[PDB]
Design a binder for this molecule. Structure first.
Ligand SMILES: O=c1[nH]nc(-c2ccc(O)cc2O)n1-c1ccccc1F
Ligand SMILES: O=c1[nH]nc(-c2ccc(O)cc2O)n1-c1ccccc1F
Lengths: 208, 208
């Protein structure tokens, strides 16, 4: 059963701002999503220091970047702690209501959209480049779920039957027609080198 | 009973690097500790979104900066999630062994000590300015504890009987003799404005 939820008003406001504001420096979405993956990987690593069984769902701690020109998708996969159904519903594990308030105050006070991650709502920068985002996730304490939203004020959550992940999160960006540069190897390599050069996990850019 | 523990070798190495490297830009310690407080405050806020009773130990979410020229201490107080005894022993809730490895690799590859927070070990920047650090903490799931270290390869942990905190962490920096500028109101205000202007919680600088 596919469940449909309304975004909280503040989150719908954040998403409308991200989609409608004229702002050329879109490439920062990748750093934001890689940063979230790195934080999730730190969380499972920290839990494993006192309970090695936390890694029975997979010992490898990594980030993969998978472009697909046929499907027009860029997928960011991590083997981090994952998210429970409750975390997905609760703005993908963020304090997004308060984060949005601070971000919008900062934008009016002299800040730009690239600073979104300082407000803990960097995930939503995916909507700078994606028309639809699908998040497939598996936490050790829950089942595999798929969250999805094309903005418009709602998101869906369903159980994900296909391809079991073990543990982690996959963010599938269904790119806007005019944002296909983010599927080009040279462009992705450039962004990873510019903004994600000090991430403590291997980032593998898959080839097509 | 006061328990004495050895730092893991990598953490003792990190602390020796911080204490012995010639590096003038010491003021970044404050941003690092305020950043950790902000992360702890986000964690309790996130837990409270699904369980309001998480805030029975205190509803106020804030950061206080308390200089004391008589004791030569600068104390950073937060009402964040706090740390259990296990978190304190486990490098104050960090993945410090892996964080240190990445930080030292980066330093050799063209990075400086101000970038410590990108490696998740920013707490240890306290030793840029402090000869001794005492951390008093209270998590909802444990008792109030005091961690302490003057470096030298060990730290202690004890129960803290005095002044119950409710919930949070207090980092007491026992400043080095030549670092008393960090007790001056104008100097602290300057650092907070330069590096911590987008923190989503009130930061109150106490007066003497
Ligand atoms: O805790 C977990 N588990 N999985 C995630 C996760 C979220 C978004 C994302 O693009 C990638 C991720 O791996 N997070 C997380 C990370 C950062 C902030 C809040 C969070 F919930
Ligand atoms: O989770 C909690 N609870 N309390 C803390 C805490 C640690 C240091 C600090 O200067 C202030 C804090 O409030 N943290 C935390 C924050 C950042 C990284 C790892 C952590 F454990």
């Amino acid at each position: 059963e596919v469940e449909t939820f309304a975004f909280q008003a503040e989150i719908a406001q954040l998403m409308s701002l991200i989609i409608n504001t004229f702002y050329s420096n879109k490439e920062i979405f990748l750093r934001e999503l890689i940063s979230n993956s790195s934080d999730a990987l730190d969380k499972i690593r920290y839990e494993s220091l006192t309970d090695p069984s936390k890694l029975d769902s997979g010992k490898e701690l990594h980030i993969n970047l998978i472009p697909n020109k046929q499907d027009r998708t860029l997928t960011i996969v991590d083997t981090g702690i994952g998210m429970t159904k409750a975390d997905l519903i609760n703005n993908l594990g963020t304090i997004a209501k308060s984060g949005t308030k601070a971000f919008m105050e900062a934008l009016q006070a002299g800040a730009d959209i690239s600073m979104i991650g300082q407000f803990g709502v960097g995930f939503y920068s995916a909507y700078l480049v994606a028309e639809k985002v699908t998040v497939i996730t598996k936490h050790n304490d829950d089942e595999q779920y798929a969250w999805e939203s094309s903005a418009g004020g709602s998101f869906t959550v369903r159980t994900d039957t296909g391809e079991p992940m073990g543990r982690g999160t996959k963010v599938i960006l269904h790119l806007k027609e005019d944002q296909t540069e983010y599927l080009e190897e040279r462009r992705i390599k450039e962004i990873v080198k510019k903004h994600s050069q000090f991430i403590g996990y291997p980032i593998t850019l898959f080839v097509e």
